[PDB]
Design a protein around this ligand. Structure first.
Ligand code: AU
Length: 65
């Protein structure tokens, strides 16, 4: 259970693209996004660095929280 803040997750369709990116990397992951807090909560067997790397490549660099 890992959490990221994504400051760029504000535009139309951005939270969808975040979730879709993570589910494409790990189809068994659980992903919650909150537009009020720009927080993304992830349950996955991948590492936090693997998730962050994927988010970065997608244009949504996170900060782990
Ligand atoms: Au999910």
């Amino acid at each position: 259970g890992m959490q990221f803040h994504i400051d760029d997750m504000t535009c139309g369709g951005c939270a969808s693209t975040v979730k879709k990116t993570i589910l494409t990397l790990d189809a068994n992951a659980t992903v919650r996004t909150d537009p009020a807090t720009r927080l993304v909560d992830v349950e996955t067997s991948l590492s936090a660095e693997q998730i962050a790397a994927a988010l970065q490549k997608a244009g949504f660099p996170p900060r782990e929280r």
